[PDB]
Amino acid sequence: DDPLQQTGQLFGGLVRDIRRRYPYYLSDITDAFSPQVLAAVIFIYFAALSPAITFGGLLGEKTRNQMGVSELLISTAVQGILFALLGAQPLLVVGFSGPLLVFEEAFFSFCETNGLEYIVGRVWIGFWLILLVVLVVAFEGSFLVRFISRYTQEIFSFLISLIFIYETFSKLIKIFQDHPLQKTYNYNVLMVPKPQGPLPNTALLSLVLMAGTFFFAMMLRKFKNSSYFPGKLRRVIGDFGVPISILIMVLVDFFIQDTYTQKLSVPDGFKVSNSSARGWVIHPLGLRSEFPIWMMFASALPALLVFILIFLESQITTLIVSKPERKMVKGSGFHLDLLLVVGMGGVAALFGMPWLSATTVRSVTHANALTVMGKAQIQEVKEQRISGLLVAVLVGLSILMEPILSRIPLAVLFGIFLYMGVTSLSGIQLFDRILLLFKPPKYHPDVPYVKRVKTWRMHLFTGIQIICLAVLWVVKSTPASLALPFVLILTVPLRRVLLPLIFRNVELQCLDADDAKAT
Amino acid sequence: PLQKTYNYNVLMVPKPQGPLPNTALLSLVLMAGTFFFAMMLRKFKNSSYFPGKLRRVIGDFGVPISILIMVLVDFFIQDTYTQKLSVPDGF
């Protein structure tokens, strides 16, 4: 039975996913006894805490510290545990995103322009998103995701991957820039709150940490499929390679005493940032004065656009995770996770907490972590609820391990970002055609879209795709980035009409494959 | 070796006396860059990414290419000193 199907029953698709998924409860409970699950837990723990800290610092310095880092980590823990507990697909990883930050800063700018409160209206926005998601899910209007082919999916994934790789190198370049290379340095500079001024051996040591971590990780991964050791020892080595490299880099950093490297910073306790102009509960009616009536009647509009953003991104992520190619065994849900995320965003907005949603890179990395692979062929993927709830509990309780987190150099995590970025390049078909662009036709592959169409036809199709990617890059670089989703959905009609009017029907059926195998 | 403070009133003309901030570890960086580029080029040489003439012609001179890249990288940086070749004035 189809996870998506036009059903004339109220709560139809929801109950269908319920009946498809709940009878596997005991199996989901049982299947998390392997150490590879623990490896996934420890890896995604870092992979979720580090961008959380980055985004928290960014929005703290952006929003006059209206919201900080402690609220973000506590929330991320709450949505992680509950999404693992009651999610139809608990294999997703939730978090904040860049366009969401753009929305928050735009709302803050609008509020300051009008003189309104920033945190007060968020409760009302939660109210409109709650009523609107009830309205939408009432009609089971998910079938629109059927219009998304592999073209739009892969182009969105590729742009996300390239953007995040660019962010990683931007981080490294900025940290290098903060301490330039001079000939002489004055040593009467204070270092207590922050590193002020250039330092001799810090930035390039961070670069060395990145390079060594990445080199060791790739050498280990390439050796994992070798034939140097018995299979048991080889599997034991392959199960926990990344934490092994992490420990090696950490001990190397701890052995060095003189040079300073920036380490992790976490809240002291479960406390608010302002602790002066805020409390645990925000009164929706008004903190210092009453909330305007014309705002009460006209503030529904941004709720529409934020719901559109979270809806499209979550459903695209659900398409990514639940593809049958990665040995998708049990049932996969779309409606239940979406409803849970939107309702939880609303109730978090009741507390003043911003909304969170599943992240693409974290989700694909999570799917990659729980993979049983062969000598190649992919046998299976271990799917259950335990890893996500464990990760969320760990990010909730990370505050209690202050000395351990204070000894982690920041560049090792950046190397880990480089690792996830390069490993997110596996499932792309656009990368396959990009590789095909340069290779001579004498050694071109056995896939149907090489035999059935000519050489310059493949080159022109990939040129169309990269031109689309360049336009999307111009859109994301545009300061009016709020129009970012719109051009994206502009991909949907363009494939149906213009391309078949230039290409042919056999090229249409061979190139735009719904599944990797079947064409 | 690595310290926290370095005195800048030391003479460098006949030979580098005393520790210096960014010399030997930069030589280690050059180690990594040169070796990594050489291995990447050699492994890519027998690939199938270019037409055969172009690929083999490019791979025919990998070591001087990496040497030139390292020399230009060294020349671009001005402030720090790295030890260079010494030859007699004459016969």
Residues of A in contact with B56 (CB under 8 A): none
Q: Is A404 on the interface with B (CB under 8 A)?
A: no
* Chain-chain contact of B22 with A200 (C-beta, under 8 angstroms): yes
CA A479 to chain centre: 22
Distance CA A299, CA A314 (A): 24
Report d(CA A232, CA A383) in Å as an integer: 23
Q: Which of B22, B29, B50 sits opposite A181 (nearest CB)?
A: B22
Dihedral of CA atoms A283, A285, A290, A296 in degrees, nearest 10, equals 140
Encoded tokens for B76: 């671009």
The answer for residues whose C-beta is within 8 angstroms of residue B70's C-beta and 6 or more apart is B30, B33, B34
Cβ within 8 Å of residue A42, ≥6 positions away: A243
Q: How far is B8 from chain A (nearest CA, A)?
A: 7
**Partner residue opposite A443 with nearest CB, options B29, B48, B77:** B48
A187 vs B contacts (CB less than 8 Å)? 4-5
Q: Quote the CA–CA distance of A247 and A122 in Å, as a whole number.
A: 42
C-alpha A61/C-alpha A68 separation (Å) is 9
Query: In 10 A of CB A362, how many CB atoms?
Result: 20
Residue A238's identity, in one-letter code, is G
Sign of CA dihedral A84, A90, A92, A96: negative
Interface test with B, best of A183, A184, A214 (most B CBs within 10 A): A183
The count of CB pairs under 8 A between chains A and B is 46
- Cα end-to-end distance, chain B, whole Å: 37
Encode A44-75: b = buried (16+ Cβ within 10 Å), e = exposed. bbbbbbbbbbbbbeebbeebeebbbbbbbbbb
CB-based contact A331:A288 (threshold 8 Å): no
B29 in contact with chain A, both atoms CB, cutoff 8 A: yes
Q: Report chain A's terminal Cα–Cα distance, integer Å.
A: 22
The Cα A432–Cα A430 span in angstroms is 5
DSSP string, A289-356: SPPPHHHHHHTHHHHHHHHHHHHHHHHHHHHHHT-GGGT--S---SHHHHHHHHHHHHHHHHTTPPP-
* Other residues' Cβ atoms within 10 Å of the Cβ of residue B46: 9
Q: How far is CA A103 from CA A33, A107, A353, A417, A490, in A?
A: 41, 6, 14, 25, 21
CB contact under 8 A, B80 and A443: no
Q: What is A350-413 written as a DSSP string?
A: HTTPPP-EE-HHHHHHHHHHTEEE----EEEE---SHHHHHHHHHHHHGGGGHHHHTT-BHHHH
Nearest CA in chain A to B31: A208
- Among chain A residues, the shortest Cα distance to B9 is held by A184
CA dihedral (A41, A43, A47, A53) positive or negative: positive
Distance CA A465, CA A434 (A): 10
Q: Give dist(CA A68, CA A271) in Å, integer.
A: 10
Query: CB atoms < 10 A from the CB of A317, how many?
Result: 25
Letter for the amino acid at A81?
A: I
Token duo for residue A131? 């009523």
Residues of A in contact with B34 (CB under 8 A): none
Quote the CA–CA distance of A302 and A500 in Å, as a whole number.
Answer: 37
Determine the distance in angstroms separating the CA of A169 from the nearest CA of chain B, rounded to an integer: 17
Residues A200, B22 contacting (CB under 8 angstroms): yes
Calpha distance A220→A238 (Å, rounded): 8
Give chain B positions within 8 Å (CB) of A445: none
The span from the CA of A69 to the CA of A58, in Å, is 10
What kind and span of H or E run contains A95? strand A94-95
DSSP for residue A94: E
CB of A319 closer than 8 Å to CB of A148: yes
- Measured in angstroms, the CA of B78 and the nearest CA of chain A are apart by 9
Which residues does chain B break after (C to N > 2.5 Å)?
Answer: none
CA-wise closest residue to A492 among A158, A136, A156: A156
| CB-based burial, A382-404: b 16+ in 10 Å, e otherwise | bbbbbbbbbbbbbbbebbeeeee
Is the distance from CB of A95 to CB of A76 less than 8 angstroms? yes
Question: Which residue from B minimizes the CA distance to A182?
Answer: B79
Q: How many angstroms separate the CA atoms of A336 and A341, rounded?
A: 9
Task: Return the residue matching tokens 């928050």.
Answer: A104
For residues A469 and A434, the answer to whether their CB atoms sit within 8 Å is: no
Residue A61 to residue A59: CA distance in whole angstroms: 5
Furthest-apart CA pair in chain A: how many Å?
76
Task: List all residues 6 or more positions away from A124 whose beta carbon is below 8 Å from its beta carbon.
Answer: A284, A291, A295, A296, A299
- Closest alpha carbon to A461 in A510, A391, A396, A398: A510
Name A372's bridge partners.
A380
Query: Among the residues of A139-199, which ranges form H helices?
Result: 150-178
How far is the C-alpha of A9 from the C-alpha of A138, rounded, in Å? 10
Which residues in chain A (165-184) have CB-CB distances under 8 A to chain B?
181-184
Our CA-based measurement puts residue A30 at a distance from the nearest CA of chain B, in whole angstroms, of 45
From A436, which residue of chain B is nearest by alpha-carbon distance? B49
- Nearest residue to A154 (alpha-carbon basis) of A498, A373, A468, A365: A468
DSSP classification of residue A243: H
Find the helix or strand (DSSP H, E) in which A495 lies: helix A491-496
* Nearest partner of A415 among A45, A39, A36, A50, judged by Cα: A50
Q: How far is CA B89 from CA A164, B11, B14, B86, in A?
A: 54, 23, 16, 9
Q: How far is CA A427 from CA A109, A271, A323, A346, A447, in A?
A: 39, 41, 11, 34, 15
Decide if A41 contacts A395 (C-beta within 8 A): no
**Residue burial B49-81, b: 16+ Cβ < 10 Å; e: rest:** ebeeeebeeebeebeeebeeeeeeeeeeeeeee
Which residues are bridge partners to A128 per DSSP?
A: none
Beta-carbon separation of A258 and B4 below 8 A: yes
Inform me whether the C-beta atom of residue B25 falls under 8 Å from chain A C-beta atoms. yes
Phi-psi region of A215 (alpha: psi -120 to 50; beta: other; left: phi over 0): alpha
Output the CA torsion sign for A55, A99, A130, A284: positive
- By C-alpha distance, the chain A residue nearest B77 is A181
Whether A208 sits inside 8 A of B80 (CB atoms) is no
SS (H, E, C) A3-40: CCCCCCCCCHHHHHHHHHHHHHHHHHHHCCCCHHHHHH
Dist CA A470 CA A149 (whole Å): 20
Residue A139, token pair as written in the block:
């009609």
The span from the CA of A479 to the CA of A467, in Å, is 20
Is A206 exposed, middle or buried (CB count within 10 Å of its CB: 0-12, 13-18, 19+)? Answer: buried
